[PDB]
Structure 1
Amino acid sequence: SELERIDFIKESVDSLTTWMNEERDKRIVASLTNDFTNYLYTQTMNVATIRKAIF
């Protein structure tokens, strides 16, 4: 660690923080996207479909 001048605690903490952020957000997204009871399909995303979804 001292040879390759890597402060391991610091670098590991900030990379693990980034990982924790991404994984919590992925929990949120996975639960949000699992098993749509109500959805719209379209070939291409257009404002017609967004308006239809708000309606």
Structure 2
Amino acid sequence: FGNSLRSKIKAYSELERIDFIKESVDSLTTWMNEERDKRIVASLTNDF
């Protein structure tokens, strides 16, 4: 499983002051962590 993010044109990225590589890496690490944890919880709380 995974995600991805696509940026805007580099001119806009440097114009609205987003460093898309770093922000995307951080936010996707976050999303991945909650995805693994939800996997664990969903398997754990499956049929009892």
Normalised to the residue count of structure 1, the TM-score between the two structures is 0.65
| Alignment partner, residue 31 of structure 1 | 43
Matched, 1:20 2:38: no
Tell me: higher relative CO, structure 1 or 2? Use CA pairs within 8 A at least 6 residues apart.
Answer: 2
Residues in 1 aligned to 2:21 and 2:14: alpha-carbon distance in whole angstroms: 12
Matched, 1:9 2:21: yes
Residues in 2 aligned to 1:14 and 1:27: alpha-carbon distance in whole angstroms: 20
- Return 5+ residue gaps in structure 2 as ranges: 1-12
Amino acid at match of 2:20: F
Higher strand share: 2
How large is the RMSD of aligned CA atoms in angstroms? 0.3
- Return 5+ residue gaps in structure 1 as ranges: 37-55
Normalised to the residue count of structure 2, the TM-score between the two structures is 0.74
